[PDB]
Amino acid sequence: MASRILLNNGAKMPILGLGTWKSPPGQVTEAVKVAIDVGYRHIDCAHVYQNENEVGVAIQEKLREQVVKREELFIVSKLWCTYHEKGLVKGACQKTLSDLKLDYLDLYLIHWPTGFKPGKEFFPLDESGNVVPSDTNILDTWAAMEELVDEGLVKAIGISNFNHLQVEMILNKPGLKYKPAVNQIECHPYLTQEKLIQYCQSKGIVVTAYSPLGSPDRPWAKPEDPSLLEDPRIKAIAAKHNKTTAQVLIRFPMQRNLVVIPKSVTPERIAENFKVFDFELSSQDMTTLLSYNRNWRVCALLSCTSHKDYPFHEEF
Ligand SMILES: NC(=O)c1ccc[n+]([C@@H]2O[C@H](COP(=O)([O-])OP(=O)(O)OC[C@H]3O[C@@H](n4cnc5c(N)ncnc54)[C@H](OP(=O)(O)O)[C@@H]3O)[C@@H](O)[C@H]2O)c1
């Protein structure tokens, strides 16, 4: 297992990164500092997480401390849905760059294919629960993303939560200048994503797996929901290999040629989670973990199920 995967922009991306959704602003600076100290070189961020300033304090201190050089870090952020119009993309990117203390991103993703009405609220509502859409489509927002590459603000651009028809729409765009480098999607043993992974990889698009541990701290968790970290079949595979359940859940996507971005703010788990380059799951283990698919999603964007570009009606 090599540490980096080659992207279609010619750059290499670390296959293990640190997630930051739900990392409290008063804890995420130390989380990122610890992560860089123990070997992480990839941080996954987003404006909608409301903690980029604090992530940036950590990055900037480790660069100032010469723990790491900027060229060795791979920092990812995401354009939120209320910024899909052409005239707002650059300012959104630049706000994220300012917050993160950076003069470029390694990768900037369209966070969801659904555009929302611009304004202060991240989920604008009409009077009844519905999300108020934007009329700007995925292809004009993609052109605005391409402009960021050509202005030097981002090294690579990509997409997140796009279904295969939507990836295809991008790939078929008239006048396409840059293909997406990455599609970041939910992926774990309960949502194994064979069809969409197969499609993206066949096109040279790298897939990043989010919520690899099943997001036990997701806000809408219900007790009845399945739980990867407590699944006795996964605990048995981990015991066989003398690893933790989380380590198995992180190694699983790595062996599918995916990038994976487990989140923690706990120093011991941050270090734990990185110690996954030292064992291998068998093919039998991999097929066994794949067999647990339940099409179960952490992130179903439930307020947006009537949006024209809602991604999860489609089989994949
Ligand atoms: N593109 C998108 O739309 C999107 C959507 C969702 C997620 N993401 C990205 O993917 C990242 C990861 O997904 P996620 O945050 O949903 O969840 P996750 O990484 O599946 O799980 C995070 C949860 O697992 C706990 N945890 C971490 N390591 C552990 C270990 N070794 N043992 C036991 N528990 C452990 C964390 O607790 P502590 O933090 O308290 O240690 C936290 O409660 C996000 O943070 C974000 O960067 C992107």
Q: Residue 244's domain is classified under what CATH number?
A: 3.20.20.100
Q: Is the CB of 114 inside a 6 Å radius of any atom of ligand 1?
A: no
Alpha-carbon dihedral 237, 240, 244, 245, rounded to 10 degrees: 10
Domain count within the chain: 1
CA separation for the pair 308, 135 (Å, rounded)? 10
261 lines ligand 1 (CB under 6 A): yes
Look at residue 210 and give its three-state secondary structure.
Answer: strand
SS (H, E, C) 225-272: CCCHHHCHHHHHHHHHHCCCHHHHHHHHHHCCCCEECCECCCHHHHHH
Read off the amino acid at residue 106.
Answer: D
Ligand 1 nearest atom to the CA of residue 273, by list position: 31
211 Cα: distance to centroid of ligand 1 (angstroms) = 5
Q: In 10 A of CB 171, how many CB atoms?
A: 15
For the chain, helix (H) and strand (E) counts, in that order, are: 10, 10
Q: Which residues contact 133 (CB under 8 A, 6 or more apart)?
A: 114, 115, 116, 117, 307, 308
Classify residue 90 by burial, with Cβ atoms within 10 Å: 0-12, 13-18, 19+: middle
CB 160 within 8 A of CB 194: no
Q: 């992560």: which residue's tokens? A: 35
Output the DSSP codes for 10-71: S-EEESB-EE-TT--HHHHHHHHHHHHHTT--EEE--GGGT-HHHHHHHHHHHHHTTSS-GG
Residue 310 annotated as catalytic = no
Q: Could you give the 3-state DSSP secondary structure of residue 110?
A: strand
CA of 88 from ligand 1 middle (Å) equals 29
Whether 101 contacts 60, CB under 8 Å: yes
Domain holding 38, by residue range, is 1-316
Q: Is position 159 annotated in a ligand binding site?
A: no
Which residues partner with 184 through β-bridges? 160, 208
Ligand 1 lined by 211 (C-beta under 6 Å): yes
Q: Considering 40, 49, 108, 178, which one is annotated as catalytic?
A: 49
70 is in an annotated binding site: no
Give the position, in ligand 1's atom list, of the atom nearest the Cα of 23.
39
Residue 265 CA to ligand 1 centre (angstroms): 9
Contacts of residue 296, Cβ cutoff 8 Å, sequence gap at least 6: 190, 191, 225, 226
